[PDB]
Amino acid sequence: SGSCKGRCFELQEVGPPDCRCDNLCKSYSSCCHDFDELCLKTARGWECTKDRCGEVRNEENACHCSEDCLSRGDCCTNYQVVCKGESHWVDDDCEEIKVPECPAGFVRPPLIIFSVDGFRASYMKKGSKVMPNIEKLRSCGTHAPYMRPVYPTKTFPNLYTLATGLYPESHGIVGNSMYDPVFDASFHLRGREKFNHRWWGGQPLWITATKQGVRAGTFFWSVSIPHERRILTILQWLSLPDNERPSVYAFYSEQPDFSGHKYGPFGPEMTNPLREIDKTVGQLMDGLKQLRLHRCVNVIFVGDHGMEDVTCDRTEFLSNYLTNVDDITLVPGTLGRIRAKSINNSKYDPKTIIAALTCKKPDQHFKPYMKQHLPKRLHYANNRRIEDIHLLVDRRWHVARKPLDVYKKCFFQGDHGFDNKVNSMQTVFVGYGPTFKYRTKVPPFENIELYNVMCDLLGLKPAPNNGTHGSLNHLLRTNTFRPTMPDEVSRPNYPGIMYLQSEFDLGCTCDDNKLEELNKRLHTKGSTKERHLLYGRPAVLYRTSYDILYHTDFESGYSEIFLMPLWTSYTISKQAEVSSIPEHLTNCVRPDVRVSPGFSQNCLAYKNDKQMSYGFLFPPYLSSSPEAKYDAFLVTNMVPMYPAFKRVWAYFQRVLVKKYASERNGVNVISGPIFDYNYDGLRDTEDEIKQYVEGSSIPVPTHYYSIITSCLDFTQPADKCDGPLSVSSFILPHRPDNDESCNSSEDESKWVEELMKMHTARVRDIEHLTGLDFYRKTSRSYSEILTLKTYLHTYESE
Numbered sequence: 103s104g105s106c107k108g109r110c111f112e113l114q115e116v117g118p119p120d121c122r123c124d125n126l127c128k129s130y131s132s133c134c135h136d137f138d139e140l141c142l143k144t145a146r147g148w149e150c151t152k153d154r155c156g157e158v159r160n161e162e163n164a165c166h167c168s169e170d171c172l173s174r175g176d177c178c179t180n181y182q183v184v185c186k187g188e189s190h191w192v193d194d195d196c197e198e199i200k201v202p203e204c205p206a207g208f209v210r211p212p213l214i215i216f217s218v219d220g221f222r223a224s225y226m227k228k229g230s231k232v233m234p235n236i237e238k239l240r241s242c243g244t245h246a247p248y249m250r251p252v253y254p255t256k257t258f259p260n261l262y263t264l265a266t267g268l269y270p271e272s273h274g275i276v277g278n279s280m281y282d283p284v285f286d287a288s289f290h291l292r293g294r295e296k297f298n299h300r301w302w303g304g305q306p307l308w309i310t311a312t313k314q315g316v317r318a319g320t321f322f323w324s325v326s327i328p329h330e331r332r333i334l335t336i337l338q339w340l341s342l343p344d345n346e347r348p349s350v351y352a353f354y355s356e357q358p359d360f361s362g363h364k365y366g367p368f369g370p371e372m373t374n375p376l377r378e379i380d381k382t383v384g385q386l387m388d389g390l391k392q393l394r395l396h397r398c399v400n401v402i403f404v405g406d407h408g409m410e411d412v413t414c415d416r417t418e419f420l421s422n423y424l425t426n427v428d429d430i431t432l433v434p435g436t437l438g439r440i441r442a443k444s445i446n447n448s449k450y451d452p453k454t455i456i457a458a459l460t461c462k463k464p465d466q467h468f469k470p471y472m473k474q475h476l477p478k479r480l481h482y483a484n485n486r487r488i489e490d491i492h493l494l495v496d497r498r499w500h501v502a503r504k505p506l507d508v509y510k511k512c513f514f515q516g517d518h519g520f521d522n523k524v525n526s527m528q529t530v531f532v533g534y535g536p537t538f539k540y541r542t543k544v545p546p547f548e549n550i551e552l553y554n555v556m557c558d559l560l561g562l563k564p565a566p567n568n569g570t571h572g573s574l575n576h577l578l579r580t581n582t583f584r585p586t587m588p589d590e591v592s593r594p595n596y597p598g599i600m601y602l603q604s605e606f607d608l609g610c611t612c613d614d615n616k617l618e619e620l621n622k623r624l625h626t627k628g629s630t631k632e633r634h635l636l637y638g639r640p641a642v643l644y645r646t647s648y649d650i651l652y653h654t655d656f657e658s659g660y661s662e663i664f665l666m667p668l669w670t671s672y673t674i675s676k677q678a679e680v681s682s683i684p685e686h687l688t689n690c691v692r693p694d695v696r697v698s699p700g701f702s703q704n705c706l707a708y709k710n711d712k713q714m715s716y717g718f719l720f721p722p723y724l725s726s727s728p729e730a731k732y733d734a735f736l737v738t739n740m741v742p743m744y745p746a747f748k749r750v751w752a753y754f755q756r757v758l759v760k761k762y763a764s765e766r767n768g769v770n771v772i773s774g775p776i777f778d779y780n781y782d783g784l785r786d787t788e789d790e791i792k793q794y795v796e797g798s799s800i801p802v803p804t805h806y807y808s809i810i811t812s813c814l815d816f817t818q819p820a821d822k823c824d825g826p827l828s829v830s831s832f833i834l835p836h837r838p839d840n841d842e843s844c845n846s847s848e849d850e851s852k853w854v855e856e857l858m859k860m861h862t863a864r865v866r867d868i869e870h871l872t873g874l875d876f877y878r879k880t881s882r883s884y885s886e887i888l889t890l891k892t893y894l895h896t897y898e899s900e
């Protein structure tokens with residue numbers, strides 16, 4: 103019954119039953135009676151024409167061509183072009199913006215986030231001819247060839263990750279559809295529940311801004327508000343007095359995604375939606391230019407995810423695998439999440455569901471996982487809203503429970519939601535404005551990094567998040583964030599020879615000159631350490647007790663608590679040779695006379711444990727000499743490994759490391775165990791360990807990592823590199839079977855590398871999982887090193 107007069111798109115939202123004129127009033131059925139009439143004017147459309155110039159202001163018109171419109175801030179965006187003989191922003195040469203050029207009274211450059219739904223990364227190249235405004239932003243500002251979304255590659259998880267800097271498992275929007283068993287409530291795209299505040303965790307940019315005195319415009323736009331009105335509203339807000347004007351704004355377009363679903367990512371129908379988005383960008387930039395804000399505002403052009411070809415004939419049906427299909431609830435589509443239809447069903451067994459879904463058809467287009475066994479790079483486990491059973495669906499496919507679900511609801515030709523390394527899921531980033539660099543291309547990066555940068559652009563302190571603050575400094579002309587390396591918490595001991603062989607009772611056996619004798623002592627004292635520890639030792643960022651152990655071919659930081667290395671570091675040159683394990687050493691394990699029997703593993707435990715065997719972190723295959731090979735059989739280089747995993751590990755060590763050393767001109771490798779029994783992506787304390795080698799205190803890792811570093815300029819060997827580095831890493835699941843690899847009965851050359859690629863990782867992922875900090879001593883700037891630590895090698899083509 104109240105009125106919207108003078109309150110159109112009010113930023114502060116009024117408490118019902120007072121009627122609301124804020125954006126979200128439509129989404130709640132609560133708009134004042136005159137909302138449409140006052141706030142959604144459309145009369146005479148969206149452009150000035152020659153005859154409208156200098157008209158008398160008519161308040162019914164969608165936008166204005168009257169002389170007073172600029173001061174009022176509500177001209178049609180083409181007003182100066184049509185009426186004052188100005189040029190469209192897109193027709194102007196670009197000129198470097200070295201400093202903000204803002205009207206007096208602006209305390210900081212405003213930020214406009216221009217978000218576009220389903221804008222696949224390759225549209226920047228493929229649609230360049232039909233998008234001149236976007237192409238000007240891209241070539242004049244700072245751009246990446248693509249930006250990596252989070253998993254699942256759906257809208258709300260990705261947009262709320264942009265808003266918060268958090269993985270979906272931490273912010274809580276883990277899908278477009280969710281069941282929370284604590285609330286016993288469901289979240290759906292359609293409907294009311296999704297507005298409840300208890301779904302949305304972390305602290306989004308608009309709250310961060312507000313808490314720190316920076317005003318924010320709306321981020322969420324009702325679908326029925328036309329795009330032109332969203333633009334004109336932003337432009338209106340920017341004309342507000344200093345004390346009311348927001349400093350951060352978002353625009354959102356549901357295109358190209360909406361058409362992409364109907365026509366496929368490159369259907370011929372897709373050209374028009376791309377033209378329309380470009381026209382809207384043009385309206386914004388012309389509107390900014392009229393307000394003399396086009397060299398003041400920082401603009402971010404960003405997508406949430408891309409779009410893949412998906413049709414309803416590419417659907418896998420669980421009813422083809424499960425006899426019990428009606429006892430489960432499936433969240434379906436480009437991912438699958440399974441739980442019991444009824445929690446009173448005591449018969450429901452997830453292990454047998456997984457078994458029935460595992461490698462059952464030769465070209466099966468989905469793979470089942472317990473969530474803790476998903477590639478750690480997905481960070482998709484630590485939330486009660488993520489079901490225990492997950493299906494990773496092949497790109498281009500869908501999963502559904504029963505054929506009825508798909509034909510009782512081939513309309514669509516496009517979908518998204520797949521693994522976030524899939525090329526078709528990649529999206530876009532362009533930054534344009536005084537705070538961004540000029541004509542600069544930056545490498546691809548993950549959208550979890552953007553919240554920190556948007557905070558930097560606004561002078562805000564970011565809430566704790568999953569970005570690595572400083573890793574995106576190379577996008578910025580100024581306002582860079584200059585972090586300090588975390589302080590080492592535990593200093594190592596450097597044990598010398600302290601124990602006689604006969605003090606060890608380990609059930610371990612091994613069939614075991616003064617020039618060469620001073621020689622071996624110097625190696626044990628760290629004489630080759632500069633060859634094998636190229637970037638300094640890792641820093642231990644938690645309280646523990648550990649020892650540095652030096653050897654000819656490798657150095658290790660040995661944990662007295664976990665009875666194995668936290669890390670083992672070694673360098674393999676291009677010329678290095680692979681040798682075999684000599685017969686007299688096949689089951690040799692040697693006591694390490696620097697490390698007490700009581701802080702050592704023992705062979706008897708492995709003998710007793712019928713499921714568990716052991717491997718080595720530094721591979722004996724790569725020893726530099728027959729004498730150095732004995733070091734690789736030290737009990738302090740041994741780690742527990744299931745026989746099934748040893749097939750993976752042996753192939754990596756015997757074949758792949760040497761191959762990488764040939765291809766990259768030497769590699770430095772750091773390997774070690776990871777313990778993440780509660781799947782939170784973070785280092786377990788010793789009291790979280792769920793499994794031990796039978797009858798011992800030897801803890802069983804959930805994963806094994808390796809970080810493989812070389813020179814980015816591969817004409818320089820890894821050990822003599824002058825400039826930037828190149829890295830690939832993995833976090834391999836330490837599993838007692840190879841059920842994840844359907845071809846594992848074949849030779850390791852047909853399936854191990856594929857497994858490793860699936861479990862590619864960032865160094866930063868390994869850092870969270872181990873509590874270590876790598877690359878402490880390089881000649882590189884720290885921000886460059888933070889970019890390196892966030893790098894992910896995806897193994898996708900161009």
Ligand SMILES: *[C@@H]1O[C@H](CO)[C@@H](O[C@@H]2O[C@H](CO)[C@@H](O[C@@H]3O[C@H](CO[C@H]4O[C@H](CO)[C@@H](O)[C@H](O[C@H]5O[C@H](CO)[C@@H](O)[C@H](O)[C@@H]5O[C@H]5O[C@H](CO)[C@@H](O)[C@H](O)[C@@H]5O)[C@@H]4O)[C@@H](O)[C@H](O[C@H]4O[C@H](CO)[C@@H](O)[C@H](O)[C@@H]4O[C@H]4O[C@H](CO)[C@@H](O)[C@H](O)[C@@H]4O)[C@@H]3O)[C@H](O)[C@H]2NC(C)=O)[C@H](O)[C@H]1NC(C)=O
Nearest residue numbers: 271272273274302303304484485486566567568782783870
């Ligand atoms: C990515 O970045 C994020 C952000 O930095 C990292 O997440 C942080 O991880 C921290 C370490 O795990 C975690 O710290 C805990 O916080 C507890 C207090 O939490 C509340 O308050 C904060 C601050 O405002 C808030 O952010 C939290 O929000 C979470 O929970 C709500 C409601 O459930 C959600 O809406 C929201 O989405 C978010 O959920 C996520 O986090 C929780 C865990 O906090 C998950 O369970 C969810 O699945 C989801 O992922 C909260 O509202 C605090 O109580 C904890 O302290 C316990 O542990 C310490 C150890 O030092 C112990 O000393 C304390 O006494 C306490 O133990 C007691 O409780 C134990 C558990 O119940 C019990 O076992 C003991 O016996 C003790 O009595 C802890 O400090 C921090 O909350 C999150 N923050 C966020 C936003 O997620 C994340 O790790 C990064 N990821 C990676 C891979 O790096």
Ligand SMILES: Cc1cc(OCc2n[nH]c(=O)n2C)c(-c2cc(C(=O)N3CCN(C)C(=O)C3)ccc2F)cc1Cl
Nearest residue numbers: 215217258261264265297298299302321322323352354
């Ligand atoms: C660029 C961007 C755009 C955003 O939305 C654009 C949009 N408009 N219309 C439409 O369908 N979409 C997708 C969002 C976004 C904001 C909210 C919100 O605003 N929230 C959440 C908590 N709840 C409970 C709130 O009160 C506020 C919710 C979901 C979001 F995706 C975030 C960013 Cl960073």
Ligand SMILES: [Ca+2]
Nearest residue numbers: 219220257406
């Ligand atoms: Ca979307």
Ligand SMILES: [Ca+2]
Nearest residue numbers: 778784785786
């Ligand atoms: Ca953990």
Ligand SMILES: [Cl-]
Nearest residue numbers: 276277278279
């Ligand atoms: Cl979902």
Ligand SMILES: [K+]
Nearest residue numbers: 708711712714
């Ligand atoms: K055994």
Ligand code: NA
Nearest residue numbers: 840841843846
């Ligand atoms: Na297998």
Ligand SMILES: [Zn+2]
Nearest residue numbers: 220359363518
């Ligand atoms: Zn979509």
